[PDB]
Amino acid sequence: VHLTPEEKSAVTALWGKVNVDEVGGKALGRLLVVYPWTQRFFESFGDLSTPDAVMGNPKVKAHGKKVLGAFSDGLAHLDNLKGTFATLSELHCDKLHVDPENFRLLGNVLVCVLAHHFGKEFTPPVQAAYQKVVAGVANALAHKYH
Amino acid sequence: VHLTPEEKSAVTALWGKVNVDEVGGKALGRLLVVYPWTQRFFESFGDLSTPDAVMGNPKVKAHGKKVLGAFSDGLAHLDNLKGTFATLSELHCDKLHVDPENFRLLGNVLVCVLAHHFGKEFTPPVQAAYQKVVAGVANALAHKYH
Amino acid sequence: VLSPADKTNVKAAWGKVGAHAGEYGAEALERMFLSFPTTKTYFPHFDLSHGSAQVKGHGKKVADALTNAVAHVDDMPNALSALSDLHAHKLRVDPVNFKLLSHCLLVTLAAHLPAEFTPAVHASLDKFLASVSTVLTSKYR
Amino acid sequence: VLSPADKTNVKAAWGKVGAHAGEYGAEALERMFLSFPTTKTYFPHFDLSHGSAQVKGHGKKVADALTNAVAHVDDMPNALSALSDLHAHKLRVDPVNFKLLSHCLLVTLAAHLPAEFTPAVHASLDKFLASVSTVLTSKYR
Ligand code: HEM
Ligand code: HEM
Ligand code: HEM
Numbered sequence A, B: 001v002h003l004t005p006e007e008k009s010a011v012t013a014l015w016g017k018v019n020v021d022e023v024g025g026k027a028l029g030r031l032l033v034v035y036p037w038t039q040r041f042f043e044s045f046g047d048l049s050t051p052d053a054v055m056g057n058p059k060v061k062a063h064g065k066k067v068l069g070a071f072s073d074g075l076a077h078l079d080n081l082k083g084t085f086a087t088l089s090e091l092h093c094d095k096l097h098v099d100p101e102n103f104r105l106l107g108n109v110l111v112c113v114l115a116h117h118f119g120k121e122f123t124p125p126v127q128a129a130y131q132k133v134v135a136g137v138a139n140a141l142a143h144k145y146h
Numbered sequence C, D: 001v002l003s004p005a006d007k008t009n010v011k012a013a014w015g016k017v018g019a020h021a022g023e024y025g026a027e028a029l030e031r032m033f034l035s036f037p038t039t040k041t042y043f044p045h046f047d048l049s050h051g052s053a054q055v056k057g058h059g060k061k062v063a064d065a066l067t068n069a070v071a072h073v074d075d076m077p078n079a080l081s082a083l084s085d086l087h088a089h090k091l092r093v094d095p096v097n098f099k100l101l102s103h104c105l106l107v108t109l110a111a112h113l114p115a116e117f118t119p120a121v122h123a124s125l126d127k128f129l130a131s132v133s134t135v136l137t138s139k140y141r
């Protein structure tokens, strides 16, 4: 993924302000609420019966931190997204059999969460840069399908 | 795309019975009829106002023959689809900006047309083989978006 | 959204299916399980071998549900609410799988009813199955 | 298919747009044009510059169309038929573009209505925009 240097600076500046302990949870949580069928891959996580239950689920929050960390790993090596996500791709694709369109959906939910949290600061150009990043991450996680 | 010797044999036997001057036009015409927005990419082709107009449109038929020729080329190079289709990928993705979901739709319309022409001969196992082929072609065409 | 002609096309086409509805339903599932192996993960308790009596019996259920949908094409949400409860609330089926089964049904129909599978009818059946899919994958009560 | 709660959710949230229709609509369009440049090709010769008065006026039309959709949420095809004529019949807009604009509208609402954009409301708005999208990209005359 190629971001202009101004785009990379804008992306990393905002990311440095993202709460490492909550944002991943809010994005994963919203994926489960907005695209309910994704709840199927997390049966062992417990209570996902209502939006509130999903958002407050300790396992959703803990797992969300791991998802966010992967995004951060992606941002630190934009020129090696496929290698960075290789093990993860095999896990989701060949093992968990998560359909690929769902990767794009999580990336977009993450963008919505960033907009919701940062308000006006999540400007259109900033969003444009993040879209390049989440598309790259989704394509890298789908790699074992291309 | 890896096919078993049994799969390659069945795929090849079926393809040999394909009328190369017509099947491609039928598949392209059905794409334009079943998913109407695809007509936007062919506004220079003339009358695409009704299903009969689309199916009998000489330009649709002629172009469909080229599309079919590309699928035939793919069948002969299943181990190197990304290379074989590099030029076509640049045309469809970079120049024409065709969304990649449309490549998947055309491949499935081609499969429906094979079913339509061959009836009982287009068995479930033969369809399974063809789905791997058309998925491979769609993926190679979409390579510039990966 | 189906047009009035789409509904007419669907009723005329599905009407021709008639007594084979069960057989075609079974064939569409078999085509789906063989062509798209991940779809099999929704039926771990099923004998999915060719000719499986379970697949044959399930094919009839799917087929009869489509007949019901056709009969209630103007009011599918109400008519298919129990199926939506099952597919969306309980089984949580990923919508991609509905596009795969829909495609397999079209293939089955093209393979058995060539005269009837005209381009206009193909277009109408695709939209109809997409609408059925949306109802079955939506939680609306 | 929208649930009664989805409808209550959409009406409440979209009802806050009010006098901000043009502003929010313009922002969603600008987000789409910048994030997904290929969409600009549907608007050749439009002044698509930052702060463009043409985009602001267009944003108002899009937002007002959604207000119309909300006021006829249980019978949308009949309320949006002229927009279907325009996007499906005339412009032949590829459905992917509606997914891009819908996402940009959600991003815009999430940036402006923090209290309203709860996970449940987010889910309802996504479904609502997906339904509006299906109506506008379908030919049902
Ligand atoms: C596209 C963005 C995504 C990223 C960056 C991501 C990242 C991760 C990471 C880092 C793990 C932990 C792996 C480990 O334990 O070593 C994981 C696990 C998992 N992911 Fe994802 N993921 C993504 C999307 C998805 C989607 C869309 C789904 C399903 C709808 C999904 C389902 C799962 C499941 C089921 C697990 C295993 C949870 C368990 O341990 O039980 N992921 N993911
Ligand atoms: C997925 C399988 C497809 C294959 C194998 C294929 C193949 C081809 C080939 C061989 C050409 C001629 C290129 C040349 O002469 O340089 C072509 C042209 C073209 N294709 Fe495709 N194509 C596919 C899908 C699509 C789709 C889905 C669309 C859009 C909905 C599309 C739109 C076009 C257009 C607009 C042209 C140029 C036509 C002209 O001369 O005006 N193609 N394609
Ligand atoms: C055209 C679309 C579909 C229709 C009309 C349909 C219809 C039905 C019907 C009528 C039943 C039986 C319900 C009952 O006896 O209570 C059923 C069950 C089921 N369906 Fe579907 N279905 C469709 C698509 C799908 C898809 C795409 C999947 C997943 C790949 C799926 C997975 C299942 C499962 C797992 C069951 C339960 C089977 C059992 O354990 O007995 N269905 N469906």
Ligand code: HEM
Pocket (backbone or CB within 6 Å): D039, D042, D043, D061, D062, D063, D065, D066, D083, D086, D087, D091, D093, D097, D098, D099, D101, D102, D129, D132, D133, D136
């Ligand atoms: C939420 C979905 C959308 C809504 C509610 C919507 C609504 C509208 C409305 C109300 C108009 C003006 C009608 C008139 O003045 O008679 C319009 C025009 C137009 N829309 Fe959309 N639209 C949507 C999505 C899209 C998308 C996704 C595209 C393409 C990316 C698009 C492209 C256009 C174009 C090209 C025009 C005509 C502009 C002109 O040349 O005057 N629309 N839309």
